[PDB]
C-alpha cells in the first residue's frame, strides 16, 4: 500500500548514504557487496571478524588470478 | 547609587546587584579561561542616558581586567586606583592606563 | 539459517564465485566460517567509534570540504538514532579505506 | 612567514592592551593562509601543486 | 640536544611534543606526523584552540 512503499525509500536513502561513507573512506566495496555486509551486521555479528573474512577473501582472490 | 555601582566595578572589581540595575551583567559558571571572551555583557537597556556607548565600553574593559587579574592571573595585589561634571573621561582613562599596562 | 545464506552470498559477492559447485567457493566459505569462529578481538568500543567519527568530521572541516563535512555529520547523526551501529561504522572504517577523494554524490 | 612576522611583531609590541595583541595575532595567522595555498579559494592552485609534488617522488622512482 | 635548539629555556623545549594523528589505513608516517606545540595557561587566551588548529594546517603544508 503506502507504508510498504515509504520503507523502501527510507532504505534506498540509507543504502546510498552508506555507499557515500564507503567511498569517502575509499573502501573497496561496491553497492552490491555493501548490501550483504549491512544485512549481516543487522543481526549482530562481530565486525572485527567479518572484516578479517573480507580482508583475506580479497587476499586469496589474487593468488587465483 | 549608579555612580556607587560604577565606583566599585572599576577600582576593586565588584558587580553586586541582585536586581539588574548596572549595565554590566556577569554571566556565572565561566570558571574556565572564557573570562575574557564571555562572562561580561554590556546590557544596553541599563546604560543610563548620561553615559555614551564608549564610556560604557571602557568601564567594562577595566572591570573585566581587574577580575581577569584576580581570577586567571592569580595576582591579588590591586587596590587599583554635564553628564557627571566631565570627570567620567578623566578618571577612566587613568584606570585604563594603569591596569592594562600592569596586565 | 539466514546467517548461512548471508555468508554464502557474501562469498559469492566479494570473491566473485557464483558457482557453489566450485571447490574454490567451498574453500572460501570454510575459511570465512573458520575466521568467524576464531574469536581473537575485543568487542566494539562505542566511545572509540564516536571519537573516530568525530575525527573524520574534523579532518573534513580542516581540509575545507564543507559539503562533505556537513554531509558526514548529518548522516552519522541520523544513522546513530535507531551497538550494531558502531559495528557497521568500525566495519566500514577498517574494510579498506584511505583516500581523500571527491565523493560528492549528493 | 617573514614579512607577516614583521607585520605581527611591530603591531603587537606597540600596543598597550591585550585586545590588540589577540586581534593582530589572528591577522598574522590569517594572512599566512592567504599568502600560502591553504585557503579555500587557493586550494585549486594547491591541487595543481599536488601534481608537481607528485612529480618529484615520481622522478625519484 | 644535537642541534642548537637545546641552548634555550627548558620551558619551551618541554612544551613542544610529537602529536600522533589518527591512524590511517595503508599509508606511511610521512603523511601522518605533525608537531602540536601544546599550551596551558593564561597564554591560552592568546593562543586559543582556533590558533593551534590553523598552525597545524600550516605545518601540514
Curated annotation (Swiss-Prot), chain A:
GO terms for cellular component: centrosome; cytosol; gamma-tubulin ring complex; interphase microtubule organizing center; spindle. It is found in: Cytoplasm, Cytoskeleton, Microtubule organizing center, Centrosome; Cytoplasm, Cytoskeleton, Spindle. Its main location: cytoplasm. One of its GO terms (biological process) is gamma-tubulin complex localization. Coiled coil: none annotated. Keywords: Acetylation, Cytoplasm, Cytoskeleton. Required for the recruitment and the assembly of the gamma-tubulin ring complex (gTuRC) at the centrosome. The gTuRC regulates the minus-end nucleation of alpha-beta tubulin heterodimers that grow into microtubule protafilaments, a critical step in centrosome duplication and spindle formation. Belongs to the MOZART1 family. Associates with the gamma-tubulin ring complex (gTuRC) consisting of TUBGCP2, TUBGCP3, TUBGCP4, TUBGCP5 and TUBGCP6 and gamma-tubulin TUBG1 or TUBG2; within the complex, interacts with TUBGCP3 and TUBGCP6 to form a luminal bridge with actin that stabilizes the initial structure during complex assembly. Interacts with TUBG1. This is Mitotic-spindle organizing protein 1.
From Swiss-Prot, chain C:
It comes from the Eukaryota. It is found in: Cytoplasm, Cytoskeleton, Microtubule organizing center, Centrosome. Widely expressed, with highest levels in heart and skeletal muscle and moderate levels in brain. Component of the gamma-tubulin ring complex (gTuRC) which mediates microtubule nucleation. The gTuRC regulates the minus-end nucleation of alpha-beta tubulin heterodimers that grow into microtubule protafilaments, a critical step in centrosome duplication and spindle formation. Component of the gamma-tubulin ring complex (gTuRC) consisting of TUBGCP2, TUBGCP3, TUBGCP4, TUBGCP5 and TUBGCP6 and gamma-tubulin TUBG1 or TUBG2. TUBGCP2, TUBGCP3, TUBGCP4, TUBGCP5 and TUBGCP6 assemble in a 5:5:2:1:1 stoichiometry; each is associated with a gamma-tubulin, thereby arranging 14 gamma-tubulins in a helical manner. Gamma-tubulin at the first position is blocked by TUBGCP3 at the last position, allowing 13 protafilaments to grow into a microtubule. Belongs to the TUBGCP family. This is Gamma-tubulin complex component 5. The gene is TUBGCP5. The chain holds residues 13 to 128 of 1024 of the full protein.
Swiss-Prot record, chain E:
Belongs to the TUBGCP family. Ubiquitously expressed. It is found in: Cytoplasm, Cytoskeleton, Microtubule organizing center, Centrosome. This is Gamma-tubulin complex component 3. The gene is TUBGCP3. Component of the gamma-tubulin ring complex (gTuRC) which mediates microtubule nucleation. The gTuRC regulates the minus-end nucleation of alpha-beta tubulin heterodimers that grow into microtubule protafilaments, a critical step in centrosome duplication and spindle formation. It comes from the Eukaryota. Coiled coil: none annotated. Component of the gamma-tubulin ring complex (gTuRC) consisting of TUBGCP2, TUBGCP3, TUBGCP4, TUBGCP5 and TUBGCP6 and gamma-tubulin TUBG1 or TUBG2. TUBGCP2, TUBGCP3, TUBGCP4, TUBGCP5 and TUBGCP6 assemble in a 5:5:2:1:1 stoichiometry; each is associated with a gamma-tubulin, thereby arranging 14 gamma-tubulins in a helical manner. Gamma-tubulin at the first position is blocked by TUBGCP3 at the last position, allowing 13 protafilaments to grow into a microtubule. It comes from Homo sapiens.
Amino acid at each position: 500500500a503506502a507504508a510498504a512503499a515509504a520503507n523502501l525509500n527510507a532504505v534506498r536513502e540509507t543504502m546510498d548514504v552508506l555507499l557515500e561513507i564507503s567511498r569517502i573512506l575509499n573502501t573497496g566495496l561496491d553497492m552490491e557487496t555493501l548490501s550483504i555486509c549491512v544485512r549481516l551486521c543487522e543481526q549482530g555479528i562481530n565486525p572485527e571478524a567479518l572484516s578479517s573474512v573480507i580482508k583475506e577473501l580479497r587476499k586469496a582472490t589474487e593468488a587465483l588470478k | 547609587p549608579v555612580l556607587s555601582f560604577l565606583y566599585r566595578w572599576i577600582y576593586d572589581g565588584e558587580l553586586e546587584d541582585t536586581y539588574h540595575e548596572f549595565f554590566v551583567a556577569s554571566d556565572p559558571t565561566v570558571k574556565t579561561d572564557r573570562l575574557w571572551h564571555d562572562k561580561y555583557t554590556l546590557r544596553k537597556s541599563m546604560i543610563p542616558s548620561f553615559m555614551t556607548m564608549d564610556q560604557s565600553r571602557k568601564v567594562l574593559l577595566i572591570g573585566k581586567s581587574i577580575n581577569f587579574l584576580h581570577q586567571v592571573c592569580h595576582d591579588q595585589t590591586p587596590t587599583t586606583k554635564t553628564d557627571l561634571e566631565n570627570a567620567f573621561q578623566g578618571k577612566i582613562d587613568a584606570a585604563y592606563f594603569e591596569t592594562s599596562k600592569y596586565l | 539459517a539466514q546467517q548461512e545464506r548471508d555468508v554464502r552470498e557474501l562469498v559469492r559477492g566479494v570473491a566473485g564465485l557464483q558457482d557453489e559447485a566450485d571447490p574454490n567457493f567451498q574453500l572460501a566459505l570454510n575459511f570465512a566460517w573458520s575466521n568467524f569462529r576464531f574469536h581473537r578481538f575485543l568487542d566494539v568500543n562505542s566511545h572509540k567509534i564516536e571519537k573516530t567519527i568525530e575525527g573524520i568530521y574534523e579532518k573534513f572541516v580542516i581540509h575545507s570540504d564543507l559539503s562533505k563535512a556537513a554531509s558526514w555529520k548529518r548522516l552519522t547523526e541520523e544513522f546513530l538514532n535507531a551497538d550494531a551501529h558502531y559495528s557497521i561504522l568500525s566495519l566500514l572504517l577498517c574494510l579498506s579505506d584511505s583516500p581523500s577523494n571527491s565523493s560528492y554524490v549528493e | 612567514l617573514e614579512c607577516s612576522w614583521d607585520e605581527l611583531w611591530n603591531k603587537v609590541q606597540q600596543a598597550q592592551d591585550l585586545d590588540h595583541i589577540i586581534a593582530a595575532h589572528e591577522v598574522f595567522l590569517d594572512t599566512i593562509i592567504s599568502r600560502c595555498l591553504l585557503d579555500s579559494d587557493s586550494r585549486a592552485l594547491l591541487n595543481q601543486l599536488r601534481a608537481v609534488f607528485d612529480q618529484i617522488i615520481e622522478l625519484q622512482n | 640536544r644535537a642541534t642548537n635548539a637545546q641552548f634555550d629555556s627548558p620551558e619551551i623545549l618541554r612544551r613542544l611534543d610529537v602529536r600522533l594523528l589518527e591512524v590511517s589505513p595503508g599509508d606511511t608516517g610521512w603523511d601522518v606526523f605533525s608537531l602540536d606545540y601544546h599550551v596551558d595557561g593564561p597564554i591560552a587566551t592568546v593562543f586559543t584552540r582556533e590558533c593551534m588548529s590553523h598552525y597545524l594546517r600550516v605545518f601540514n603544508f
